[PDB]
């Protein structure tokens, strides 16, 4: 915070003559100098404004709802990665539908699920170590294909600075409990499952490794992160009967 | 502009000896210093070149065709947003097809519609105010779902600096009068409508608010902005008969 | 002027994701850095705000009315100053009252004369010279005291950069045609003169010199500068009869 | 605050040899460099010391006693100003004498009123507005002159950054309850009024406007601010009888 | 001083070709760069030129005549101030008239006393102390009011850096031996005293303290400082008879 | 240009006290700082003033008279240069005398030809190329020596930044139509030619190439540039008879 | 060298949208800033471009041919210089003609000797010394004048940083084996000598000293340095017969 | 020195208002900025204050008494060092005791010899040389061991910038004429010698060389430097008898 906002100093009148605080006058001079510098670089900004950057989805619009799923420890050898989850498509749908619906009900407002993200969050199990986390994934395969429990690292994704990676699971492929802007209806998992076209094909298979030259022991927290926009009317909630 | 481009100074020869302008020689020295600095930071740029940014679609490739649709005034209470449009899917398609085709015909070149954007452009109705604009939207719902006229603000999109927001309406969902690279054929709205699979489901529902602590009065201009790439041959237009 | 005010760049939405112009984001970063610097120096400004400076009366409040009186040439020897005017108190009052009233009538608004200033404005009569102007003055004396036409310079006032000096003639001493906030009444010079208590005592005696080591030839323009504040009602002027 | 004042580091003696902290020695070196810079700019300060600035009267010597008088709301059209007060000279004296004497009694010390200031303090009645305040005033007029309630703005005083203007009411013109350095005597308003020579002539007439292009609603707090210097002896207060 | 003024270098002609010193040419280049910078900040100065500062009266126009009056030692307790002088109005006038007239006669030129200043000059009586001086004053009181010899400090004036304070004694209140621009006449103290209207009311009562937390011993030199402008004609002084 | 020259701000006098604009006072402070810096580097300039540079003859004294001679296109292979002109000494003298005399007559003032320069001016015949121009020359040879039309490049002169090279043809070698400071007499080419001692020996043979790795097509403009100083008396031209 | 020239980064297209490398975009921004700075200083360069400097003849056009002549050791006392060579004019011509012709034959191309330079190159004969070299010379004298072997130093030439001095021997005075642009003819020294007008008058007499306060021992290498421009046609050399 | 210490500017009082010099106010602002910077780096100094440096013993506490012993010239070959002194232990004690006692008597105060230092001071015997001095030493050996007069240099001590090296001779090993804090007694060399336990073992053997690649001739001054602290009472010296 500031002390005076930007209303520093004052003014008074003596014998028709007008006095103003010296520090405020010096700010006016310095602000004029800055205003001149703002105009000198405007054409430079116009060059930079040929391009755009993307707002962080998790700090940006929509609320975050973190449906944590499970925790797990793995020990990973150097230059390898270990599989984090090996659910079938049906088991992943059971967890997706069951954990979100039971956590969120009652859903009392119209809302739309903007995106579904698979969240991998990693932390060391020992102090005084120095290394970074890597990641690889796939999202679909023959239902009778069983993934290797451990693979060698090859051009992996490098996990970001806070040791979190979030992978978007697009509506193309992965089914949401709430498709569009809607109120909830009566629903159940069997209805949900039956209306998914390819329940057994899509399922996140995620691997985790490090950049260490020794074995490291890792704690993993896995979550589904829903981005949600609500459409709550500007009206009161009354006890029945109303009025 | 510059005065001399970068051809400052000159040269002459006196008694076999070659003279060159002092200012040009001082530029050669300064350019060598800069060249050395360019090489010192090259490895730093290589780090930055691990990442990429996205060209502004409206300043970038393709031409812009702004099909303005209507204007509207709303008064919006603090912490709320008011609905801008409430067309059914059919009415939105009538406006989309009718306004674009009638504005653009005759379409005399092969062309492709790259993208369709919904443009929301906002301006204050009073001077001496200080506040910013916010936005929320949805794109589909049950045809018998009628959107709330006013909602409370919750994690909205913050409209950009020039008080314009443009929302992409992807070919996935929203139907275009010209699908691919094509010449025009004979067409009409009934043919168009009949070949859209889900005419009644998709329709932009957009809300507008502010960051003000008082009621504000807003003027809204809504447009469809088409990005178009043309394929005009390098040939003459002659009066018939040719040659 | 600027090109974009401070509304540089824009924003758009693609697949729920929000893009903003890179140059605008870089300005937001730079403005945060400046905001931090503004807070670091606030305590320094608080020290400077212990003192105050005075607004230029001629660029400040009240309008200026320059009643030019006469012009005059003098040649001045080094280290001396020559007298500019030698009116008695009555002759100065005749010029003061006559020149202001005749120039300003009709005076159609309530108004107050804030201050009366004696303006000395000097310009060289030869090019390619380099020197500055000096000034000395007195404001009252025995009516039978006649001032020396030329004096030696001793600790004079150094005229300011634009070769103008303006000396305040305070209501204490010098009589104004309009004393307070008033409408005009029927008036004449004899009424005015008779109501001045000491008409013969007060009169500006002003001398002019230079900082040159040679004789210089100077053109002098002498004026009375009135500072006036008007109280014009917010009402129409109609042709009689009104309504 | 600081942590160590300027007594950083220490010293010890080993085998006749004297050790001192490295950071303190580096400060001694840096202070010598600064001392050298202080001497390089001394002649520059001597140039600046040809001029002087004025200490803020309200942060400077004498105590402040704010006798608030009343509050008021005005709505002011663009380019106009509205009258704040329209008291006669007698009514202004009644408020001046009554409010100060009743607030301050018992006055138990010798003291002098240094100055009397008319304080105008302004604040917006709506949030999210951006504009500044302007002021105009007069101090005397025919007692049967009634000021216009609203005037058009013409070269006004621009109120200072904190939205306060303070206008000096000099002893020349405006009468004080305590004239010089004195103890209080028995006094009353009738005695006070009778000894003022021109009670009906002097009275502050103050107008307020803005720099806005819309109507704005303003809250006004008006006060008399007395600057007072006390002469309290360095002696005890005892319960009677003393000693 | 400089060595070459600003006439560094030279020029010569060889075979029609003109050579100039390299250092002078480099100054011409640097001066052009500065000239460009002078124009970049001109608009900033125009902002600062909205305000004005006041020339030091003692370094400014008019000569200084320091009529020292007396010296005095006081010991002052912390948070208190001791009275410096306690003359009646008549005794102060005797010292003012007697000391100035006897010091200055013969007064051989026309002159005007611009201002009269009361000078308080303070110096420590012990070395190796660190503290500053404070001041408070009054200028008039009932003739039978006797000032307290010691008062507690309350919002005092902080003496300036050189341990001098000078208080203006205006013609309004305090009588001068020479009123306006005049030659001297035959005069004496009785004539002077009799023509002062209120001889017994006005008299400077000045107090001195410190910012020390211990008792300090102070040496005080008190003077009247006259600012004088002379009007000496540009004529010879001859031995009589002239010519 | 500047707005105020260096006469920014002003001064006025209030109650003997002298006010000056704050921006002007801040310039005085900054100029003192610069004056101090000017003296710190004076000894450095004295080192640079041990050497001298040469004024551009074409921007320097004497007027320029460009007698263009012809234009020509050449295509030049990489690492080669092509001959620009192959006149005998007599043909070069015919062009030199004929083109200058016919262009300049009537020559109505006393004047001296300071220098004669051969001007080679080059420009590309295609856009979007990047290369520089080179030059080689000789000035005399056996009259029956015929120069090679194309030579390989070997340590050539690199043409200056503006693609002009000017080669001095000294009076030693090359004959001028006007030898010294003179009025014109009756003259003709035969008289001129007969008085040249070695008409057939001296003749500029100039070659042009590039720094390109491809063939380039060049447009060449060749001129004689005369530097002339005139001695025109300060007298009127009258219609005959005079007076 | 650089790694990427100035082609850093790349571009790709995803869903009509265009991405470019961040480092390249940051270079574009920085280059725009530099371009703006280039235009700010252009007027400053125009001032510097009033003057010119001279290209180093030995790094500049024409090839260098160093005909070393002899080596010599001298011991030189402080403040003195010793003679380096004392040839008559004939002996200097024998060395000049004989050493150049025998070194350079066969001369197979048309060429011109641009300049002849006398090269003095000096090196210390002891390590761990610190001093500089000085030079003085003359170029002609009565043939029966014999130069002093040692002279006292008086305003000498200070040899340049690399301990080489090169003195131009102009065609005016000193005769060249090849006068103009020519092929070689049959020639011999007697023919050459007989056609020199003043063989016995011109001869370089050069002296060498130091800035040391002790005796120093110096090794001297003396050479004639010819600057030569060749005119080699762009044609093949074939074995006879050609074609 | 400075001109004003840090008491620049002054203050005065006009109409209750307090003026202070502008340059002093600008210093107050700049000092506040510096005070803020002092607090920003305090934590950095705390890091540096983890370590300590040692006061130069010769500029530090205790007085210096330089008992010069002898002078000597040596010529030293490259990469070698020559012996400076070859005294036995007894001869070194004779010089140490005899030279100090005879130089210093009468010793009239209580005092302690803090340290004894062997001083080697070197200077070149020729000008215009560039090289540095090296040193090696030993302090004890078998009395019948005779040191080599010249040794090859191997990892020597590099003499400091002023060409002085001072080697501490500790009380452990080397005997002092005054052991502790004492008055002098009657003493002689035989008493001194007899009470030294190992007179023949300890003796400084010092060698000197250079970093030159040539022979150099060196002048050597060798001294014993005593550091002494005196305990002189604060009492008068009277002529006997006292009082």
Swiss-Prot record, chains A, B, C, D, E, F, G, H:
InterPro entries: Polyhedrin. Keywords: Viral occlusion body. It comes from the Viruses. One of its GO terms (cellular component) is viral occlusion body. GO terms for molecular function: structural molecule activity. Component of the virus occlusion bodies, which are large proteinaceous structures, that protect the virus from the outside environment for extended periods until they are ingested by insect larvae. Belongs to the polyhedrin family. This is Granulin. It comes from Cydia pomonella granulosis virus (isolate Mexico/1963).
């Amino acid at each position: 915070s500031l002390r005076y906002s930007r209303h520093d100093g004052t003014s008074c009148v003596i014998d028709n003559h007008h006095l103003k605080s010296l520090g405020a006058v010096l700010n006016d001079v310095r602000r004029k100098k800055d205003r001149i510098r703002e105009a000198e670089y405007e054409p430079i900004i116009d060059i930079a404004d040929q391009y755009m950057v993307t707002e962080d989805p998790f700090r940006g619009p929509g609320k975050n709802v973190r449906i944590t799923l499970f925790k797990e420890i793995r020990r990973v050898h150097p230059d390898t990665m270990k599989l984090v989850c090996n659910w079938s498509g049906k088991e992943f749908l059971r967890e997706t539908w069951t954990r979100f619906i039971s956590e969120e009900f009652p859903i009392t407002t119209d809302q739309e699920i903007m995106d579904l993200w698979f969240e991998l969050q990693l932390r060391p199990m020992h102090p005084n170590r120095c290394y970074k986390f890597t990641m690889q994934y796939a999202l679909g395969a023959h239902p009778d294909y069983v993934a290797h429990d451990v693979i060698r690292q090859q051009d992996p994704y490098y996990v970001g600075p806070n040791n979190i990676e979030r992978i978007n699971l697009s509506k193309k492929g992965f089914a949401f409990p709430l498709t569009c802007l809607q109120s909830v209806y009566n629903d159940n998992f069997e209805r949900f499952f039956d209306d998914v076209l390819w329940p057994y094909f899509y399922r996140p298979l995620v691997y985790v490794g490090t950049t260490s030259a020794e074995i490291e022991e890792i704690m993993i927290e896995v979550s589904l992160l829903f981005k949600i926009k609500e459409f709550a009317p500007d009206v009161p909630l009354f006890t029945g009967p109303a009025y």
